[PDB]
ileal lipid binding protein (Sus scrofa), 127 residues
Amino acid sequence: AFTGKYEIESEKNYDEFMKRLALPSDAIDKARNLKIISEVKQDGQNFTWSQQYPGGHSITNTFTIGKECDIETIGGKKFKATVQMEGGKVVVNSPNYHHTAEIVDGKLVEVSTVGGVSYERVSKKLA
Ligand SMILES: C[C@H](CCC(=O)NCC(=O)O)[C@H]1CC[C@H]2[C@@H]3[C@H](O)C[C@@H]4C[C@H](O)CC[C@]4(C)[C@H]3C[C@H](O)[C@]12C
C-alpha cells in the first residue's frame, strides 16, 4: 500500500476493453487466463508501475502524480495523460479514458473506464 509485487486476484472485462483500446490479436490471446503480476515500485510522488505478463510480453510505466505524463506504444498512439491522486486512490485520466487505482484488504483494485466499457481488476499483494 501502494508499493509491492502484486499478483492478479481476478479480472472480468479485459477482452472487450482491448477492442476499445485498439490492441492486437497478439495481446488478446496471450492474456487468456494468465496470472498477470502488477509490480509497483513507488519512487515518491513518482512511480514505476509494471503489468508483467508470463506470455512473452510485459508493460512497464514510469509516471508522476500531480502532472501530465507522456504515453506511447499501447495501440500505436502518442498520447499525453493527466496523472493524479483521487481521494485515497491513484488515477490516470486522458481523452476518452479514466483509470482509478484504489486500495482494499492490502490489495489493489483498479477500475478502467473507456468509450462504452469499464474494466475492473483486483490485484492481491502476497509477496
Ligand atoms: C493511456 C493509455 C490509453 C490511451 C488510449 O488509447 N485511449 C483511447 C482509447 O482507449 O481508444 C492506457 C491504456 C492502458 C494503460 C496501462 C494499463 O492500464 C496498465 C497499467 C495500469 C497502471 O494503473 C498505470 C500504468 C499502466 C501501464 C497503464 C498506462 C496507461 O494508462 C495505458 C497505456
